[PDB]
Amino acid sequence: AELLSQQWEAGMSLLMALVVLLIVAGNVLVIAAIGSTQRLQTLTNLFITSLACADLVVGLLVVPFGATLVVRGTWLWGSFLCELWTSLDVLCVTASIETLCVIAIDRYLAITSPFRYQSLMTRARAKVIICTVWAISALVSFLPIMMHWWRDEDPQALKCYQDPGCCDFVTNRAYAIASSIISFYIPLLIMIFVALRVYREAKEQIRKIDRASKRKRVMLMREHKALKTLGIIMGVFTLCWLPFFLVNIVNVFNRDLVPDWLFVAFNWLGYANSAMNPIIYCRSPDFRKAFKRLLAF
Ligand SMILES: CCCCCCCCCC(=O)N(CCO)C[C@@H](O)[C@@H](O)[C@@H](O)[C@@H](O)CO
Ligand SMILES: CCCCCCCCCC(=O)N(CCO)C[C@@H](O)[C@@H](O)[C@@H](O)[C@@H](O)CO
Ligand SMILES: CC(C)NC[C@H](O)COc1cccc2[nH]c3ccccc3c12
Ligand code: NA
């Protein structure tokens, strides 16, 4: 037995150590591929950078510690770092879904009103939107956790708060529902609604083609190119997290209905999404050229 443990430990410390690499590496790749490639410095890729820092923090901070928790069974870093870890964990997920939301709206405006967009949206502004998207996210994730709004009266929760070795995120039903709606479900329904519109209008444009000029076109042509890449990016994020949050809502009405491992599974599917973006950006010939550039092929 005491050996069958040892296998699973170092065996799992291998996957954990691996995903960290695939996450950090992949995203640092994406941040450099924009930070040093003239044609990959669109406005949209400023958000993609933002999006890639959320994922980057996930790989340096969220997972490492979350690793040492699945593997070693307990929490080893004290009751404070438990809160901070949980906050950073919640922050990144909200900040992601929020940037993915902006990115959706952003395209919609640039596709339907390619104009008011071009004059209104400046790089200096886009940063203010990124800052605003983090500022909100921070506020919704960190503060309520800091103020213990999440805690339960239940003896389960109560005992887990007492123990500096428990770092289960046992949350009262209210925080569950409220925080999952604010941080996830609304942003997601907005993003899906906007994304279906951006898809429909994108179709009507190609349906009504070479009816526009070469000037009215070589500026639409450019913004359409990369839509599908983004539509994937969104569609994956949705599938990677919807289960975790579907299960979270289910767990409110009916604790002891969906197995605790399936819960932790899904949360890990969620962290997995942080390493899927760069792989998906390899659709783009420019990113691919930039990744080879950086790896020194
Ligand atoms: C952006 C975050 C969204 C806000 C979520 C926090 C609100 C939680 C409500 C509150 O103020 N509580 C006490 C504050 O400590 C929690 C209690 O409501 C809770 O203990 C129970 O009454 C029910 O939740 C039953 O599960
Ligand atoms: C972001 C919200 C979701 C945006 C969805 C974008 C769909 C636009 C239509 C589309 O992607 N194609 C037309 C057939 O449906 C295929 C090709 O256009 C594509 O492979 C590339 O060539 C790029 O032009 C991407 O538009
Ligand atoms: C068990 C903890 C450490 N894992 C948290 C997940 O990574 C992400 O969970 C969330 C992300 C964003 C908003 C959230 N609201 C929640 C309410 C209850 C449970 C998780 C979340 C949650
Ligand atoms: Na604790």
mmCIF file with all atom_site columns, N, CA and C in Angstrom, residues 219-266:
data_model
loop_
_atom_site.group_PDB
_atom_site.id
_atom_site.type_symbol
_atom_site.label_atom_id
_atom_site.label_alt_id
_atom_site.label_comp_id
_atom_site.label_asym_id
_atom_site.label_entity_id
_atom_site.label_seq_id
_atom_site.pdbx_PDB_ins_code
_atom_site.Cartn_x
_atom_site.Cartn_y
_atom_site.Cartn_z
_atom_site.occupancy
_atom_site.B_iso_or_equiv
_atom_site.pdbx_formal_charge
_atom_site.auth_seq_id
_atom_site.auth_comp_id
_atom_site.auth_asym_id
_atom_site.auth_atom_id
_atom_site.pdbx_PDB_model_num
ATOM 1   N N  . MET A 1 219 ? -10.754 46.074 -45.620 1.00 0.00 ? 219 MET A N  1
ATOM 2   C CA . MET A 1 219 ? -10.821 46.376 -44.192 1.00 0.00 ? 219 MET A CA 1
ATOM 3   C C  . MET A 1 219 ? -11.811 45.485 -43.439 1.00 0.00 ? 219 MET A C  1
ATOM 4   N N  . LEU A 1 220 ? -12.766 44.871 -44.136 1.00 0.00 ? 220 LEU A N  1
ATOM 5   C CA . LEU A 1 220 ? -13.612 43.833 -43.529 1.00 0.00 ? 220 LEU A CA 1
ATOM 6   C C  . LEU A 1 220 ? -12.924 42.467 -43.612 1.00 0.00 ? 220 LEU A C  1
ATOM 7   N N  . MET A 1 221 ? -12.431 42.136 -44.803 1.00 0.00 ? 221 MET A N  1
ATOM 8   C CA . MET A 1 221 ? -11.593 40.954 -45.036 1.00 0.00 ? 221 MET A CA 1
ATOM 9   C C  . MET A 1 221 ? -10.623 40.712 -43.880 1.00 0.00 ? 221 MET A C  1
ATOM 10  N N  . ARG A 1 222 ? -9.982  41.782 -43.405 1.00 0.00 ? 222 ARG A N  1
ATOM 11  C CA . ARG A 1 222 ? -8.943  41.677 -42.372 1.00 0.00 ? 222 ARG A CA 1
ATOM 12  C C  . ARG A 1 222 ? -9.481  41.296 -40.999 1.00 0.00 ? 222 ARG A C  1
ATOM 13  N N  . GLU A 1 223 ? -10.671 41.782 -40.675 1.00 0.00 ? 223 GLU A N  1
ATOM 14  C CA . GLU A 1 223 ? -11.211 41.606 -39.342 1.00 0.00 ? 223 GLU A CA 1
ATOM 15  C C  . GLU A 1 223 ? -11.985 40.308 -39.237 1.00 0.00 ? 223 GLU A C  1
ATOM 16  N N  . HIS A 1 224 ? -12.584 39.886 -40.349 1.00 0.00 ? 224 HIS A N  1
ATOM 17  C CA . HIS A 1 224 ? -13.161 38.542 -40.463 1.00 0.00 ? 224 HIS A CA 1
ATOM 18  C C  . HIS A 1 224 ? -12.113 37.455 -40.293 1.00 0.00 ? 224 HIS A C  1
ATOM 19  N N  . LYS A 1 225 ? -10.930 37.686 -40.852 1.00 0.00 ? 225 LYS A N  1
ATOM 20  C CA . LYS A 1 225 ? -9.853  36.706 -40.783 1.00 0.00 ? 225 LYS A CA 1
ATOM 21  C C  . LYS A 1 225 ? -9.336  36.678 -39.349 1.00 0.00 ? 225 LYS A C  1
ATOM 22  N N  . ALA A 1 226 ? -9.597  35.569 -38.643 1.00 0.00 ? 226 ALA A N  1
ATOM 23  C CA . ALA A 1 226 ? -9.301  35.461 -37.203 1.00 0.00 ? 226 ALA A CA 1
ATOM 24  C C  . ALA A 1 226 ? -10.557 35.368 -36.345 1.00 0.00 ? 226 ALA A C  1
ATOM 25  N N  . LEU A 1 227 ? -11.724 35.570 -36.940 1.00 0.00 ? 227 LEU A N  1
ATOM 26  C CA . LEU A 1 227 ? -12.977 35.386 -36.208 1.00 0.00 ? 227 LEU A CA 1
ATOM 27  C C  . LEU A 1 227 ? -13.117 33.936 -35.761 1.00 0.00 ? 227 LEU A C  1
ATOM 28  N N  . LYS A 1 228 ? -12.948 32.988 -36.677 1.00 0.00 ? 228 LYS A N  1
ATOM 29  C CA . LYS A 1 228 ? -13.113 31.579 -36.329 1.00 0.00 ? 228 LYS A CA 1
ATOM 30  C C  . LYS A 1 228 ? -12.132 31.185 -35.235 1.00 0.00 ? 228 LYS A C  1
ATOM 31  N N  . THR A 1 229 ? -10.885 31.612 -35.361 1.00 0.00 ? 229 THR A N  1
ATOM 32  C CA . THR A 1 229 ? -9.925  31.369 -34.294 1.00 0.00 ? 229 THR A CA 1
ATOM 33  C C  . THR A 1 229 ? -10.484 31.813 -32.937 1.00 0.00 ? 229 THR A C  1
ATOM 34  N N  . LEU A 1 230 ? -11.108 32.988 -32.897 1.00 0.00 ? 230 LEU A N  1
ATOM 35  C CA . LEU A 1 230 ? -11.699 33.516 -31.664 1.00 0.00 ? 230 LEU A CA 1
ATOM 36  C C  . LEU A 1 230 ? -12.931 32.729 -31.264 1.00 0.00 ? 230 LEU A C  1
ATOM 37  N N  . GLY A 1 231 ? -13.761 32.386 -32.231 1.00 0.00 ? 231 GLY A N  1
ATOM 38  C CA . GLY A 1 231 ? -14.944 31.578 -31.961 1.00 0.00 ? 231 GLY A CA 1
ATOM 39  C C  . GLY A 1 231 ? -14.609 30.209 -31.380 1.00 0.00 ? 231 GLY A C  1
ATOM 40  N N  . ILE A 1 232 ? -13.477 29.640 -31.786 1.00 0.00 ? 232 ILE A N  1
ATOM 41  C CA . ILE A 1 232 ? -12.960 28.436 -31.145 1.00 0.00 ? 232 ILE A CA 1
ATOM 42  C C  . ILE A 1 232 ? -12.573 28.768 -29.700 1.00 0.00 ? 232 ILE A C  1
ATOM 43  N N  . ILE A 1 233 ? -11.605 29.668 -29.533 1.00 0.00 ? 233 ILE A N  1
ATOM 44  C CA . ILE A 1 233 ? -11.170 30.140 -28.212 1.00 0.00 ? 233 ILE A CA 1
ATOM 45  C C  . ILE A 1 233 ? -12.307 30.275 -27.184 1.00 0.00 ? 233 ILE A C  1
ATOM 46  N N  . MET A 1 234 ? -13.448 30.806 -27.628 1.00 0.00 ? 234 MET A N  1
ATOM 47  C CA . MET A 1 234 ? -14.629 30.981 -26.781 1.00 0.00 ? 234 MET A CA 1
ATOM 48  C C  . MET A 1 234 ? -15.315 29.658 -26.545 1.00 0.00 ? 234 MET A C  1
ATOM 49  N N  . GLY A 1 235 ? -15.621 28.957 -27.636 1.00 0.00 ? 235 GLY A N  1
ATOM 50  C CA . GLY A 1 235 ? -16.279 27.649 -27.588 1.00 0.00 ? 235 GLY A CA 1
ATOM 51  C C  . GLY A 1 235 ? -15.567 26.626 -26.715 1.00 0.00 ? 235 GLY A C  1
ATOM 52  N N  . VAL A 1 236 ? -14.232 26.671 -26.682 1.00 0.00 ? 236 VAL A N  1
ATOM 53  C CA . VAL A 1 236 ? -13.467 25.768 -25.827 1.00 0.00 ? 236 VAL A CA 1
ATOM 54  C C  . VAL A 1 236 ? -13.618 26.180 -24.375 1.00 0.00 ? 236 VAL A C  1
ATOM 55  N N  . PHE A 1 237 ? -13.323 27.436 -24.076 1.00 0.00 ? 237 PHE A N  1
ATOM 56  C CA . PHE A 1 237 ? -13.513 27.965 -22.717 1.00 0.00 ? 237 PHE A CA 1
ATOM 57  C C  . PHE A 1 237 ? -14.890 27.597 -22.142 1.00 0.00 ? 237 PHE A C  1
ATOM 58  N N  . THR A 1 238 ? -15.930 27.724 -22.955 1.00 0.00 ? 238 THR A N  1
ATOM 59  C CA . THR A 1 238 ? -17.278 27.385 -22.523 1.00 0.00 ? 238 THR A CA 1
ATOM 60  C C  . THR A 1 238 ? -17.370 25.920 -22.120 1.00 0.00 ? 238 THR A C  1
ATOM 61  N N  . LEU A 1 239 ? -16.934 25.026 -23.004 1.00 0.00 ? 239 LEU A N  1
ATOM 62  C CA . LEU A 1 239 ? -16.976 23.589 -22.740 1.00 0.00 ? 239 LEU A CA 1
ATOM 63  C C  . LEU A 1 239 ? -16.061 23.187 -21.585 1.00 0.00 ? 239 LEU A C  1
ATOM 64  N N  . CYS A 1 240 ? -14.907 23.835 -21.465 1.00 0.00 ? 240 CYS A N  1
ATOM 65  C CA . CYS A 1 240 ? -13.972 23.511 -20.382 1.00 0.00 ? 240 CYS A CA 1
ATOM 66  C C  . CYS A 1 240 ? -14.461 23.904 -18.988 1.00 0.00 ? 240 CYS A C  1
ATOM 67  N N  . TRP A 1 241 ? -15.381 24.872 -18.908 1.00 0.00 ? 241 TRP A N  1
ATOM 68  C CA . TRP A 1 241 ? -15.871 25.370 -17.611 1.00 0.00 ? 241 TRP A CA 1
ATOM 69  C C  . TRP A 1 241 ? -17.362 25.179 -17.360 1.00 0.00 ? 241 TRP A C  1
ATOM 70  N N  . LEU A 1 242 ? -18.178 25.114 -18.401 1.00 0.00 ? 242 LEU A N  1
ATOM 71  C CA . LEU A 1 242 ? -19.611 24.972 -18.174 1.00 0.00 ? 242 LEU A CA 1
ATOM 72  C C  . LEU A 1 242 ? -19.910 23.805 -17.219 1.00 0.00 ? 242 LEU A C  1
ATOM 73  N N  . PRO A 1 243 ? -19.233 22.634 -17.404 1.00 0.00 ? 243 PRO A N  1
ATOM 74  C CA . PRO A 1 243 ? -19.525 21.475 -16.544 1.00 0.00 ? 243 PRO A CA 1
ATOM 75  C C  . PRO A 1 243 ? -19.275 21.771 -15.072 1.00 0.00 ? 243 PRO A C  1
ATOM 76  N N  . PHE A 1 244 ? -18.134 22.387 -14.780 1.00 0.00 ? 244 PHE A N  1
ATOM 77  C CA . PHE A 1 244 ? -17.801 22.745 -13.415 1.00 0.00 ? 244 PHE A CA 1
ATOM 78  C C  . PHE A 1 244 ? -18.866 23.616 -12.785 1.00 0.00 ? 244 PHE A C  1
ATOM 79  N N  . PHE A 1 245 ? -19.375 24.594 -13.536 1.00 0.00 ? 245 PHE A N  1
ATOM 80  C CA . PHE A 1 245 ? -20.379 25.516 -12.997 1.00 0.00 ? 245 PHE A CA 1
ATOM 81  C C  . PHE A 1 245 ? -21.777 24.940 -13.044 1.00 0.00 ? 245 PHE A C  1
ATOM 82  N N  . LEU A 1 246 ? -22.077 24.084 -14.024 1.00 0.00 ? 246 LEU A N  1
ATOM 83  C CA . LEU A 1 246 ? -23.338 23.329 -14.007 1.00 0.00 ? 246 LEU A CA 1
ATOM 84  C C  . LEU A 1 246 ? -23.379 22.479 -12.746 1.00 0.00 ? 246 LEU A C  1
ATOM 85  N N  . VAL A 1 247 ? -22.249 21.870 -12.429 1.00 0.00 ? 247 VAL A N  1
ATOM 86  C CA . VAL A 1 247 ? -22.183 20.987 -11.280 1.00 0.00 ? 247 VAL A CA 1
ATOM 87  C C  . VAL A 1 247 ? -22.290 21.811 -10.006 1.00 0.00 ? 247 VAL A C  1
ATOM 88  N N  . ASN A 1 248 ? -21.711 23.007 -10.013 1.00 0.00 ? 248 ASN A N  1
ATOM 89  C CA . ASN A 1 248 ? -21.770 23.882 -8.843  1.00 0.00 ? 248 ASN A CA 1
ATOM 90  C C  . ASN A 1 248 ? -23.212 24.273 -8.484  1.00 0.00 ? 248 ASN A C  1
ATOM 91  N N  . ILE A 1 249 ? -24.015 24.582 -9.495  1.00 0.00 ? 249 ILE A N  1
ATOM 92  C CA . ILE A 1 249 ? -25.428 24.898 -9.287  1.00 0.00 ? 249 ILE A CA 1
ATOM 93  C C  . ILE A 1 249 ? -26.176 23.656 -8.816  1.00 0.00 ? 249 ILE A C  1
ATOM 94  N N  . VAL A 1 250 ? -25.868 22.503 -9.416  1.00 0.00 ? 250 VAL A N  1
ATOM 95  C CA . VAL A 1 250 ? -26.478 21.234 -9.008  1.00 0.00 ? 250 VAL A CA 1
ATOM 96  C C  . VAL A 1 250 ? -26.163 20.940 -7.541  1.00 0.00 ? 250 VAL A C  1
ATOM 97  N N  . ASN A 1 251 ? -24.916 21.146 -7.157  1.00 0.00 ? 251 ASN A N  1
ATOM 98  C CA . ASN A 1 251 ? -24.460 20.887 -5.797  1.00 0.00 ? 251 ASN A CA 1
ATOM 99  C C  . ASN A 1 251 ? -25.154 21.739 -4.739  1.00 0.00 ? 251 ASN A C  1
ATOM 100 N N  . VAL A 1 252 ? -25.879 22.760 -5.173  1.00 0.00 ? 252 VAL A N  1
ATOM 101 C CA . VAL A 1 252 ? -26.605 23.629 -4.258  1.00 0.00 ? 252 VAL A CA 1
ATOM 102 C C  . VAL A 1 252 ? -27.908 22.971 -3.830  1.00 0.00 ? 252 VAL A C  1
ATOM 103 N N  . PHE A 1 253 ? -28.733 22.593 -4.804  1.00 0.00 ? 253 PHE A N  1
ATOM 104 C CA . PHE A 1 253 ? -29.995 21.903 -4.532  1.00 0.00 ? 253 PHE A CA 1
ATOM 105 C C  . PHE A 1 253 ? -29.776 20.522 -3.928  1.00 0.00 ? 253 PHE A C  1
ATOM 106 N N  . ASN A 1 254 ? -28.717 19.839 -4.351  1.00 0.00 ? 254 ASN A N  1
ATOM 107 C CA . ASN A 1 254 ? -28.514 18.445 -3.976  1.00 0.00 ? 254 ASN A CA 1
ATOM 108 C C  . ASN A 1 254 ? -27.048 18.104 -3.712  1.00 0.00 ? 254 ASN A C  1
ATOM 109 N N  . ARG A 1 255 ? -26.574 18.426 -2.511  1.00 0.00 ? 255 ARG A N  1
ATOM 110 C CA . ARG A 1 255 ? -25.273 17.930 -2.062  1.00 0.00 ? 255 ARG A CA 1
ATOM 111 C C  . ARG A 1 255 ? -25.386 16.411 -2.056  1.00 0.00 ? 255 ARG A C  1
ATOM 112 N N  . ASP A 1 256 ? -24.277 15.726 -2.306  1.00 0.00 ? 256 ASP A N  1
ATOM 113 C CA . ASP A 1 256 ? -24.285 14.268 -2.396  1.00 0.00 ? 256 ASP A CA 1
ATOM 114 C C  . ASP A 1 256 ? -25.211 13.781 -3.527  1.00 0.00 ? 256 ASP A C  1
ATOM 115 N N  . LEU A 1 257 ? -25.089 14.401 -4.701  1.00 0.00 ? 257 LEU A N  1
ATOM 116 C CA . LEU A 1 257 ? -25.720 13.894 -5.931  1.00 0.00 ? 257 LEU A CA 1
ATOM 117 C C  . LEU A 1 257 ? -24.704 13.661 -7.042  1.00 0.00 ? 257 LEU A C  1
ATOM 118 N N  . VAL A 1 258 ? -23.668 14.494 -7.098  1.00 0.00 ? 258 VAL A N  1
ATOM 119 C CA . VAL A 1 258 ? -22.606 14.326 -8.079  1.00 0.00 ? 258 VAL A CA 1
ATOM 120 C C  . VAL A 1 258 ? -21.276 14.109 -7.351  1.00 0.00 ? 258 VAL A C  1
ATOM 121 N N  . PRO A 1 259 ? -20.585 12.988 -7.647  1.00 0.00 ? 259 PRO A N  1
ATOM 122 C CA . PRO A 1 259 ? -19.372 12.570 -6.930  1.00 0.00 ? 259 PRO A CA 1
ATOM 123 C C  . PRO A 1 259 ? -18.292 13.648 -6.799  1.00 0.00 ? 259 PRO A C  1
ATOM 124 N N  . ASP A 1 260 ? -17.672 13.706 -5.630  1.00 0.00 ? 260 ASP A N  1
ATOM 125 C CA . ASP A 1 260 ? -16.631 14.686 -5.324  1.00 0.00 ? 260 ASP A CA 1
ATOM 126 C C  . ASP A 1 260 ? -15.400 14.649 -6.250  1.00 0.00 ? 260 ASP A C  1
ATOM 127 N N  . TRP A 1 261 ? -15.075 13.487 -6.803  1.00 0.00 ? 261 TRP A N  1
ATOM 128 C CA . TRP A 1 261 ? -13.969 13.391 -7.761  1.00 0.00 ? 261 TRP A CA 1
ATOM 129 C C  . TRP A 1 261 ? -14.380 14.034 -9.090  1.00 0.00 ? 261 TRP A C  1
ATOM 130 N N  . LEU A 1 262 ? -15.647 13.856 -9.480  1.00 0.00 ? 262 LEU A N  1
ATOM 131 C CA . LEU A 1 262 ? -16.159 14.443 -10.722 1.00 0.00 ? 262 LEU A CA 1
ATOM 132 C C  . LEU A 1 262 ? -16.101 15.964 -10.605 1.00 0.00 ? 262 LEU A C  1
ATOM 133 N N  . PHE A 1 263 ? -16.364 16.453 -9.402  1.00 0.00 ? 263 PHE A N  1
ATOM 134 C CA . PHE A 1 263 ? -16.188 17.852 -9.105  1.00 0.00 ? 263 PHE A CA 1
ATOM 135 C C  . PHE A 1 263 ? -14.742 18.274 -9.333  1.00 0.00 ? 263 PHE A C  1
ATOM 136 N N  . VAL A 1 264 ? -13.802 17.628 -8.660  1.00 0.00 ? 264 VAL A N  1
ATOM 137 C CA . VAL A 1 264 ? -12.381 17.983 -8.803  1.00 0.00 ? 264 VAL A CA 1
ATOM 138 C C  . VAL A 1 264 ? -11.896 17.752 -10.235 1.00 0.00 ? 264 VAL A C  1
ATOM 139 N N  . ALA A 1 265 ? -12.492 16.780 -10.922 1.00 0.00 ? 265 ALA A N  1
ATOM 140 C CA . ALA A 1 265 ? -12.155 16.496 -12.311 1.00 0.00 ? 265 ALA A CA 1
ATOM 141 C C  . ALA A 1 265 ? -12.413 17.742 -13.139 1.00 0.00 ? 265 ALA A C  1
ATOM 142 N N  . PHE A 1 266 ? -13.675 18.146 -13.138 1.00 0.00 ? 266 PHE A N  1
ATOM 143 C CA . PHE A 1 266 ? -14.142 19.334 -13.824 1.00 0.00 ? 266 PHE A CA 1
ATOM 144 C C  . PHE A 1 266 ? -13.335 20.590 -13.492 1.00 0.00 ? 266 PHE A C  1
#
